[PDB]
Design a protein around this ligand. Structure first.
Ligand SMILES: O=S1(=O)CC(CNc2ncnc3[nH]c4cc(F)ccc4c23)C1
Length: 167
């Protein structure tokens, strides 16, 4: 039993809700919140900008130190950093950005990072400003993630389309 509330169950392990991931994280305080990161961990907009703003820029400060030490992530890769006031940990995952020409096949590799964590609160990778089709992203999620994933979808209209079209 966990504290996630109001989710629709899609599969054995995947759940979905119309919610603001920032507000969902603030209430649940999950072990892991997933950030829709880029390779530079520059949290300027989309989910990343919203999560970082909620941390009063502490996420960005921590991220800049991470990059200065380790260099950029790979597209399809991830790192675990602090969850600050939102979660115990933040898993920064880089899905391909279609608006930069990155290969969509890397979306499966990106979701594989979720399997290293038993339970996660996450957005749909490569959705929103990353330019992928969220219906495709949901399909890859369901077919790749085996751990328990609670997906927050900010836009009510998209949430309803994702549910109604789910196979
Ligand atoms: O429905 S979409 O097209 C948009 C969604 C991807 N982004 C998000 N996903 C879940 N929670 C979110 N909270 C936010 C707050 C913000 F300021 C900006 C973005 C998000 C966001 C696929």
């Amino acid at each position: 039993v966990n504290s996630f509330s109001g989710y629709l169950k899609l599969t054995d392990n995947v759940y979905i809700k119309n919610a603001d991931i920032v507000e969902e994280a603030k209430k649940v305080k999950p072990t892991v919140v997933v950030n829709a990161a880029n390779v530079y961990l520059k949290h300027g907009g989309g989910v990343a900008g919203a999560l970082n703003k909620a941390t009063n820029n502490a996420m960005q400060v921590e991220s800049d130190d991470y990059i200065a030490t380790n260099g950029p992530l790979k597209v399809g890769g991830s790192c675990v950093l602090s969850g600050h006031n939102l979660a115990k940990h933040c898993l920064h995952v880089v899905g391909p950005n279609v608006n930069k020409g990155e290969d969509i096949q890397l979306l499966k590799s990106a979701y594989e990072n979720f399997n290293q964590h038993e339970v996660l609160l996450a957005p749909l990778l490569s959705a929103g400003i990353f330019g992928a089709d969220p219906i495709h992203s949901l399909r890859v999620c369901v077919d790749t993630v085996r751990t328990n994933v609670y997906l927050a979808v900010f836009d009510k209209n998209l949430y309803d389309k994702l549910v109604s079209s789910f196979l």
